[PDB]
């Protein structure tokens, strides 16, 4: 199948919106990580490919995905970065886990529909 960018945006954006909507848990994930501002200067050493909700939104808005699994992969890159960088006690780690719970419910029917 050839997926048009407007079709991917229309189908997938609600699943991203579900993550944005989560408070407090989306807060760490709404903007790209700025290691200087956050006082975590080793972040890019450990996290080779940073990813966040706003970057994913921008990719949908600008037609950067050819396939819907590329979108799923970026969401999971964001999750895996957070579980990699943070210890299990951190808010960021626990908030990530909550987003993954929400996402799994949202994404399932949408991916089935897209095929």
Ligand X SMILES: C[C@@H]1CC(=O)Nc2cccc(-c3ccc4c(c3)c(C3CC3)nn4C)c2N1
Question: Which spans of this chain sit near ligand X (rule: CB under 6 A)?
Answer: 24, 27-29, 33, 38, 40, 82, 85-86, 91-92
**Residue 73 CB, nearest approach to ligand X (Å):** 18
Three-state DSSP state, 1: coil
Nearer to ligand X, 18 or 92 (CB): 92
Nearer to ligand X, 1 or 87 (CB): 87
Q: Which long-range contacts (C-beta less than 8 Å, at least 24 apart) are formed by 72-79?
A: 72/107, 72/111, 75/16, 75/19, 75/103, 75/107, 77/49, 77/51, 78/29, 78/51, 78/52, 78/53, 79/103
**Residue 47 CB, nearest approach to ligand X (Å):** 7
Nearer to ligand X, 5 or 35 (CB): 35
Q: Which candidate, 71, 70, 100, places its Cα nearest to that of 83?
A: 100
**Residue 88 CB, nearest approach to ligand X (Å):** 13
């Amino acid at each position: 199948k050839i997926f048009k960018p407007e079709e991917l945006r229309q189908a997938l954006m609600p699943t991203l919106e579900a993550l944005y909507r989560q408070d407090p848990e989306s807060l760490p994930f709404r903007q790209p990580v700025d290691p200087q501002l956050l006082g975590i200067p080793d972040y890019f050493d450990i996290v080779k490919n940073p990813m966040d909700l706003s970057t994913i939104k921008r990719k949908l808005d600008t037609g950067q995905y050819q396939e819907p699994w590329q979108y799923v992969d970026d969401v999971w890159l964001m999750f895996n970065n957070a579980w990699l960088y943070n210890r299990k006690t951190s808010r960021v780690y626990k908030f990530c886990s909550k987003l993954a719970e929400v996402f799994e419910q949202e994404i399932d029917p949408v991916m089935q529909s897209l095929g």
